Paper text:
Kirsten rat sarcoma viral oncogene homologue ([name]), a key component of the pathway, is the most commonly mutated oncogene and is a key driver of tumor growth in several human cancers. [name] cycles between an inactive guanosine diphosphate (GDP)-loaded and active guanosine triphosphate (GTP)-loaded state, acting as a molecular switch for downstream signal transduction. Here, we address this gap through the development of heterobifunctional [name]-based PROTACs capable of engaging and degrading [name]­(on), thus addressing a wider range of [name] mutations.
We recently disclosed our efforts toward identifying an in vivo active [name]-based [name] degrader, with 1 and ACBI3 identified as potent degraders of multiple [name]­(off) alleles. However, neither was found to effectively degrade [name], Q61K, Q61L, and Q61R. Leveraging established cocrystallization protocols, , we crystallized ternary complexes of VCB-[name]-[name] with KRASG12V-GDP and KRASG12R-[name] as representations of [name]­(off) and -(on). We obtained suitable cocrystal ternary complex structures of 1 with KRASG12R([name])-VCB and 3 with both KRASG12V(GDP)-VCB and KRASG12R([name])-VCB at resolutions of 2.83, 2.63, and 2.89 Å, respectively. We previously disclosed the ternary complex structure of [name] 1 with KRASG12V(GDP)-VCB. Analysis of the ternary complex structures of 1 and 3 with both KRASG12R([name]) and KRASG12V(GDP) showed that the same relative orientation as previously solved cocrystal structures was adopted, regardless of the mutation or nucleotide.
Author numbering:
A (entry chain D): 1 to 29, 39 to 168
B (entry chain B): 17 to 50, 57 to 112
C (entry chain C): 60 to 207
D (entry chain A): 1 to 104
The structure:
């Protein structure tokens, strides 16, 4: 059985931890789960949900082992969406490649204070060549699709 | 103003004087602190020609600002041109 | 602190790395300690919108042979700050190598380092072949050249 | 746009340059300033075909992509001793030795 190491990334408070907790235990307030995605049973292992900033050679060596990345921003926060570029570029640096499995994730679509329009993110995702999924850690909406899509983008990257 | 560079097998090469001076050796044999042609007894014509091509290459693409191409060196001429370049100080 | 080091300006500057050389280019960033740090390779003819910072020092080498290259016709590249958000352009080009150094490159690529001493060349060219391009050697040279 | 040329007659080879827009007659003028022969007594050739004195260098095939400085285009040269015209002959350069086994 193949194992897919995923890293959840984003600005502070975008809901990285909430999404992963919602993914595993189906609950909203070690990250491993066996799942069947496109007929191939695999094991998802979330590597990090902490948004603190640390450019240590050890964390680089830790992020370098991750196979997929969920770039998460909150649509209630404009700067979380603007920083997506920086998180994406840091992934390119540690992976030492321009094409790395990635998925842009917009969290907190249940909140009524949207400041980042959906049209903006799909345009940004279309420029990045990666899928874009709107998610809600409170309502389970899109959580499964967002991680499985990243697993799909990891299988796509292995030629 | 031009200068003649004579190879080992008698091939004559008229090249612009400013282009020939790119090599420290030729520069020293013509313009010392105080001379129209120089004979190279151990450089065959198929090497001295490539050296002159390097001269015009060096002169033209030095002042270039946007993009410089590679200077190609065929494998069969590589050693004979390496000896010359080391000898000519260019 | 060394002189060939980046500055912690923390002011981002979008830059375009443009490989106009026939080589696969290795972008080298000199960190705040002057230590050469490697960055993803640029195939020949490639351009990437890069995210750097003001005052950060860069140089570029052939990813395979570490041959020296030029960026905007200088050995080193420091991005200014983006005026009105427009990117700064980095134009990586080949140098006008010496005919000797270019000859060294061509034979290094054709002969494995073990067979260097199996050629009809002078002994002086043996050590010149073995003196492969090294980033640390060039940094010591470019530091001593900044004695202005 | 410049073009870089190797004017060759017998065992003599001239490395000079000119613009794509320049004509063959202007090239013949530069050969007169070097070899001291009147352009009327000059005949310039691309490979084997004679070049028209009125046609520009680019019109003859000497583009910047074919007459590069690191790989110039070759132009033949033949003189005219009074009313006697010589035959175009360019003595070829030497040959390199077979590449050593250490490089194969
Ligand atoms: C493709 C390509 N082809 C040829 S070249 C190339 C290429 C590829 C990538 C790049 C990326 N660019 C650089 O490497 C540039 C170039 C040179 O200038 C040095 N440099 C730098 O970044 C250096 C630097 C930073 C600096 O100030 C920094 C000032 C930033 C100030 N902050 C504060 C506001 C919030 N916020 C932030 N808050 C919290 C967390 C994060 C974060 N961010 O990521 C990550 C994650 C968790 C996610 C991704 C994977 C990894 S791994 C690792 N350790 C990670 C971490 N902690 C991560 N969390 N962010 C940023 C948006 C802005 N001064 O130097 C670094 C390396 C120390 C450049 C070129
Ligand atoms: N309404 C709502 N709140 C959400 C959603 N996702 C996350 N949140 C809230 O956002 C806050 C931060 O999310 P959380 O996952 O805990 O943190 P994080 O993004 O990992 C923060 P750090 O980057 O510091 O690790 C929490 O209060 C959480 O309840 C969502 O879909 N809807
Ligand atoms: Mg967290």
């Amino acid at each position: 059985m193949t194992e897919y190491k995923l890293v959840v990334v984003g600005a502070r408070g975008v809901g990285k931890s909430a999404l992963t907790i919602q993914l595993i235990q189906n609950h909203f307030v070690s990250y491993r789960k066996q799942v069947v995605i496109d007929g191939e049973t695999c094991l998802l292992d979330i590597l990090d949900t902490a948004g603190q900033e640390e450019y240590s050679a050890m964390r680089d060596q830790y992020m370098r082992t991750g196979e997929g990345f969920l770039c998460v921003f909150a649509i209630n926060n404009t700067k979380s969406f603007e920083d997506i570029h920086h998180y994406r570029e840091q992934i390119k640096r540690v992976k030492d490649s321009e094409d790395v499995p990635m998925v842009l994730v917009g969290n907190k679509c249940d909140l009524p204070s949207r400041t980042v329009d959906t049209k903006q993110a799909q345009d940004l995702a279309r420029s990045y060549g990666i899928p874009f999924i709107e998610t809600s850690a409170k309502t389970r909406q899109g959580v499964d699709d967002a991680f499985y899509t990243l697993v799909r983008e990891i299988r796509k990257h292995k030629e | 103003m031009y200068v003649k560079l004579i190879s080992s097998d008698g091939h004559e090469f008229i090249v612009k004087r400013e282009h020939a001076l790119t090599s420290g050796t030729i520069k020293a044999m013509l313009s010392g602190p105080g001379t129209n042609e120089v004979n190279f007894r151990e450089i065959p014509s198929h090497v001295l020609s490539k050296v002159c091509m390097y001269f015009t290459y060096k002169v033209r693409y030095t002042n270039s600002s946007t993009e410089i191409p590679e200077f190609p060196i065929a494998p069969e001429i590589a050693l004979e041109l390496l000896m010359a370049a080391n000898f000519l100080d260019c | 602190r060394p002189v060939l080091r980046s500055v912690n300006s923390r002011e981002p500057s979008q830059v375009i790395f443009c490989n106009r050389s026939p080589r696969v280019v290795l972008p080298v960033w000199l960190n705040f300690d002057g230590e050469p740090q490697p960055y993803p390779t640029l195939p020949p003819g490639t351009g990437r919108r890069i995210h750097s910072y003001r005052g950060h020092l860069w140089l570029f080498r052939d990813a395979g042979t570490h041959d020296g290259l030029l960026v905007n016709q200088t050995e080193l590249f420091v991005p200014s700050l983006n005026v009105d958000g427009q990117p700064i352009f980095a134009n990586i080009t080949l140098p006008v190598y010496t005919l000797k150094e270019r000859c060294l490159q061509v034979v290094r690529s054709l002969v494995k380092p073990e067979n260097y001493r199996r050629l009809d060349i002078v002994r002086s060219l043996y050590e010149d072949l073995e003196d492969h391009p090294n980033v640390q050697k060039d940094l010591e040279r470019l530091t001593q050249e900044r004695i202005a | 746009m410049d073009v870089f040329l190797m004017i060759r007659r017998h065992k003599t080879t001239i490395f000079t340059d000119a613009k794509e827009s320049s004509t063959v007659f202007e090239l013949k003028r530069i050969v007169e300033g070097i070899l001291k022969r009147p352009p009327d007594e000059q005949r310039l050739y691309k490979d084997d075909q004679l070049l028209d004195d009125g046609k520009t260098l680019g019109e003859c095939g000497f583009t910047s992509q074919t007459a590069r400085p690191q790989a110039p285009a070759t132009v033949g040269l033949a003189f005219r001793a009074d009313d006697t015209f010589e035959a175009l002959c360019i003595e070829p350069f030497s040959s390199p030795p077979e590449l050593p086994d250490v490089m194969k």
